[PDB]
């Protein structure tokens, strides 16, 4: 049986004061009934409105990225900094982060590391391209991710962790991942943590689904044995949001 | 003469809510009787709370960074978001994101003229590291950085720009800056700036001196011929920052 299910948006680089502040009051009006951790991952600028204005009790907010200390690094925040902000979920590794700004396996490792050690809940992503998938190459790269990641933590560590696996092989490119894709992709990794880090490990772990989702797919990867919820992209930015939450029944 | 000076607050990647509560709040009581533009660049996360307190009448709030546009890039802040948010000045092209962050001249002109475009004040950063300086291409690099920002300009976008000369190969290095070689670098830049875009445009440009300063030497620094105030670091965090504002009378 599964562990408790995730619901988290990331809004990614994007949101008006006025356009998010509508899209908190809908979350807060939106009735969950069941056992869900609902995550709200907006822009550094945003986090206060959405710590003042959000007030569901199913909602935690997070950051979408930081860095380990703070210091002489002009333009980035720091896990010290969220942590004063009141802030303690985050979102690390994102494959926009790995394919833009320079996140190699070992820098998403050493920040998921680090931001663990602050006392943060970590959704730390993984996820092959399309020449990495077509290439045959699925498996190595997206466990080489993950195991470079699981070279940096203890086993305790592994209770603030949570895995988004985002199929950057299906996203822009014009494809769709079925849910028995998504299936494929996340008993895989957990296959992987059973056996390098243990099962009981294993049967805990969140591994959430990045991959493009609505209000209507999100109920049928839901049902798959090894989805443990969602992290949204776009349809986070939107009403169906709420869609989504109530798939993770 | 000189054109208006500027004193700005690189806060870089630090503070407290509570700390920087009390550095405002000291800026706030200071009174400054010349005509100086204050500058608070705080971090992302603090830009609400530093525009809810901070009441100074000659002083702004900047970002330190930011992307042209919004969109999927998970953990960046766009220039549409600081404006809808209400910041109108930023920091762009520091030294610190040149050497850690993937910013390329062409990648700070692209910013800089996207910042202008959409009506920021801009405070763009150049300056030579220690190994460039000691090689003999202090001049090289500084126009090199200078002439790439510009050609994404047009003449009459000088009216929203700023240029901080950094010292780089004094930041950390063991090195000090003489009010001499500060001026010489300032020099440099207003003589490129004279031939290549407009004596109109030079003698309204303001230079900003953003290597290390205190109380004493920013005010020697001020007395250069080509020095229109300062980009401070580290001492932008500390009450000695009314000193730095009071050495541009």
Redesign the interface.
Known sequence: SKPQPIAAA?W??????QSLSELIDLFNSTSINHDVQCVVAS???????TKERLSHPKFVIAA??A?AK?????????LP??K??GVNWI?LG?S??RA???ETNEIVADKVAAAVASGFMVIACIGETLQERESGRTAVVVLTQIAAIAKKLKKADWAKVVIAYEPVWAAGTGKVATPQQAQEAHALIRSWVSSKIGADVAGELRILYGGSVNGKNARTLYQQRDVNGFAV?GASLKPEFVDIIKATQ
């Open positions: 990331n990614k680089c994007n949101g008006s004061q822009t550094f600028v945003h986090l206060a409105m979408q990225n860095i703070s210091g002489a690094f002009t333009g980035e925040v720091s900094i969220l004063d902000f979102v994102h926009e982060r833009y700004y320079g992209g």
